[PDB]
UniProtKB/TrEMBL annotation, chain C:
The chain holds residues 643 to 719 of 761 of the full protein. It comes from Rattus norvegicus (Rat). It is found in: Cell membrane. This is Transient receptor potential cation channel, subfamily V, member 2.
Length: 599, 243, 72
């Protein structure tokens, strides 16, 4: 194929004469087919042809169409040679629509355009390494690049339109591609929101029969659910409360229906309601989402009021469970303290403790079984919960060791007791503003104190071994020396025993060194703790508290395992008018800017 | 100087002078002439701590006839992602006195920490770290097991006699190895310690520990009673230096 | 005194200092162990690449949406 190697110029008579002289290499395409693969050039000839990149305007006079007409082979597919040359999953249509050139795609579609390009590869990341994820569809890439003209042409092609509900190998549609290219940068957010609304309007105008937002990918997520999971805020917020006026009103989600004054009622349509449907947006944000800004995703407007209503409805059961746990712990403390008519009371108390431990263990096991994905990904977000399980286990274990008539049951019983008293703090997540500062501590303390305590224990054990080495030839065992070093920070074991084999001075110097290391570690503790406090109390704490409340209300809404899984009642506001009847939720908000804008 | 007016003046004059030199004398590269200290203008900017001119020289791009004078190359862009082909004279490779070590060691500016996070140096250092993290963790594990052996020997010090003597031999060998390594490091970086060694004071601590260890064994080979304080001081210094 | 230089220290200085320490460490260990002499100083990053001047370079892929909102 000498034509491709000799097509360095834009266009001219050399291409025409080469094509006329070749004519399917004179009915023998052996060398033409050999050069059509990789090695001869390494890239497809169309790719090199389409980026002539003229300064004035990209021409359409290059021979790409008459060479295609001449190449009447059973494979007229406009793809990359050998299907993958460092560009797996790339075709001529993608590069053609990349250049923002209307002429090339306009003249190419009438040929074997072969839309729905489900190509092989899927290597490196997503589909290709240096290829950003755009959906592996022509119209998806066209929409992702903010090119209205090519999208419009593809959606109403004269020969065959490209279906808007098309899907790739991953299962995404074009909307999902926009969702995953919806990074929170203001320019990208504006681009994606504009393209999303425009594409919804185009789909309504062309194919109103099928709802575009109800198509789920292979993971089973709608674009709203996808935005919730991926942690995108701008596009998720827009989709949650998008309003349209005129013929596009049914496509809208909220409904500013009534306004008797500065207060106006918005009728937010919600597909995030739990109701009798699973995989709701609320649990997606609560459990499946892993973005660092997910705490802000439950305080926008409709979700905030929704969670407030759910909390106000379930606070009765929350306090009832808190009281039951408190009385159970009181009974457990009494039984542990009074453990050697009275014998009957002691035995019934032991039976009640065993029953409570079994109940908590079974509840924690059911919770873990129902949330296997959350623990599989990361269980550190709700570590308190696992603590409950541990406590329950120990309690049961204690009773087991009690039923074996052994002497070792008491440490297990006491460890349960102290773990349960520690876990009673779990119920501070509710109440009031008093929890605001008590919910953000567990996300930085557990990260800092762990490493700093590891370092402190390493230093303490080293110093203890050193003191044992001095005292060998008064710090007899390693445990005793470690205990002494732990006491030195506050209570000391100092004033060395006179003549300590002429090594009193080095021992005193080592003790002073340990004191300085402990003190400087404490100062580092304070500095590290205070470092992430100034930029944490603006709005993050309230968002974290709301997220914890949402997780708690979602967990308790499922009902106690003893009560099976109730019936999932309380469809909020049920059906309401606006021929589409969908459930909504009414929120009254006061704003005086309406009257200063809408005269 | 990093003042915005002076930075703009110097960058404009620098690009204009490069263009004039290319137009008049393209035979010889202007940026390859080194002063008596042996520093190119890029290396000079790295050492003196200037950021604006150094950043500009590191990633200056030109279009047209001045394209060869440019350093980066925005060559390909398949979408929002574009690939920049940063030319680098800061590569260690087989050449000495690279820009990386100039910023790391010879530079003394208070803002030098910002000079390794611009764009090309940041990714370059990330790649080097990802390549050398294997050896870093291997050395960390070797040091940890050496300190475990040292702690065991110190604690159990009065088949067992053979274990104790081989442990003492291993401790002496490790102390000698660390001492020699620290001496080699100091010899290779005599200028850094001559100017200021307080930037990497941890390193000198290692030397001290090693020295004490060897000293302890020396006092052990003299059959004296004073070796134990030196051995214990080494031990605690090594446990501190594990940080 | 300890808290005085903490408020104006955690914006970007800490990350720069950490990167500087990592750079110093990787430069030091790249020379190789003295027992292994000074190795051979391998790993020329990306080696030679086109653009009659052939010079070694390093490729970095960066994402920016401002290009399409500026370069139509």
């Amino acid at each position: 194929d000498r034509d491709r190697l000799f097509s360095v110029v834009s266009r001219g008579v050399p291409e025409e004469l080469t094509g006329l002289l070749e004519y399917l290499r004179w009915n023998s395409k052996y060398l033409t087919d050999s050069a059509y693969t990789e090695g001869s050039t390494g890239k497809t000839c169309l790719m090199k042809a389409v980026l002539n990149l003229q300064d004035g305007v990209n021409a359409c006079i290059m021979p790409l169409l008459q060479i295609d007409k001449d190449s009447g082979n059973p494979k007229p597919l406009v793809n990359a040679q050998c299907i993958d040359e460092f560009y797996q999953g790339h075709s001529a249509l993608h590069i053609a629509i990349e250049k923002r050139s209307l002429q090339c795609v306009k003249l190419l579609v009438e040929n074997g355009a072969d839309v729905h390009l489900r190509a092989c590869g899927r290597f490196f990341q997503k589909h290709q390494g240096t290829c950003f994820y755009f959906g592996e569809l022509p119209l998806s890439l066209a929409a992702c690049t903010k090119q209205w003209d090519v999208v419009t042409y593809l959606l109403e092609n004269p020969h065959q339109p490209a279906s808007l509900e098309a899907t790739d190998s991953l299962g995404n549609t074009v909307l999902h591609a926009l969702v995953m290219i919806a990074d929170n940068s203001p320019e990208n957010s504006a681009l994606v929101i504009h393209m999303y609304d425009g594409l919804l309007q185009m789909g309504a105008r062309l194919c109103p029969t099928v709802q575009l937002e109800e198509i789920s990918n292979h993971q089973g997520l709608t674009p709203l659910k996808l935005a919730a999971k991926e942690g995108k805020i701008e596009i998720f917020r827009h989709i949650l409360q998008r309003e349209f006026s005129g013929p596009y009103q049914p496509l809208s989600r909220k409904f500013t229906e009534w306004c008797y004054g500065p207060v106006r009622v918005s009728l937010y349509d919600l597909s995030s309601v739990d109701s009798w449907e699973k995989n709701s947006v609320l649990e997606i944000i609560a459990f499946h989402c892993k973005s660092p800004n997910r705490h802000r995703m439950v305080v926008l407007e409709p979700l905030n009021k929704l969670l407030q209503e759910k909390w106000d409805r379930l606070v009765s059961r929350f306090f009832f469970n808190f009281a039951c746990y408190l009385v159970y712990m009181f009974i457990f403390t009494v039984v542990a303290y009074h453990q050697p008519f009275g014998e009957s009371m002691l035995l019934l108390g032991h039976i009640l403790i065993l029953l409570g431990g079994i109940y908590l263990l079974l509840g924690q096991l059911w919770y873990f079984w129902r949330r296997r994905l959350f623990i599989w990904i990361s269980f550190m977000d709700s570590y308190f919960e696992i603590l409950f399980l541990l406590q329950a286990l120990l309690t049961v274990l204690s009773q087991v060791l009690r039923f074996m008539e052994t002497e070792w049951y008491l440490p297990l019983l006491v460890l349960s007791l102290v773990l349960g008293w520690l876990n009673l703090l779990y119920y501070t997540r509710g109440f009031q503003h008093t929890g605001i500062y008590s919910v953000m501590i567990q996300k930085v303390i557990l990260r800092d104190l762990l490493r700093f305590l590891l370092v402190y224990l390493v230093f303490l054990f080293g110093f203890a071994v050193a003191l044992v080495s001095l005292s060998r030839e008064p710090y007899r065992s390693i445990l005793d020396a470690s205990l002494e070093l732990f006491k030195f920070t506050i209570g000391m074991g100092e004033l060395a025993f006179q003549e300590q084999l002429r090594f009193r001075g080095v021992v005193l110097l080592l003790l002073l060194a340990y004191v300085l290391l402990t003190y400087v570690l404490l100062l580092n503790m304070l500095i590290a703790l205070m470092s992430e406090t100034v930029n944490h109390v603006a709005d993050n704490s309230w968002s974290i508290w709301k997220l914890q409340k949402a997780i708690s209300v979602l967990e308790m809404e499922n009902g106690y395992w003893w009560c099976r899984r109730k019936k999932h009642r309380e469809g909020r506001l049920l059906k309401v008018g606006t021929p589409d009847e969908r459930w909504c939720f009414r929120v009254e908000e006061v704003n005086w800017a309406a009257w200063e804008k809408t005269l």
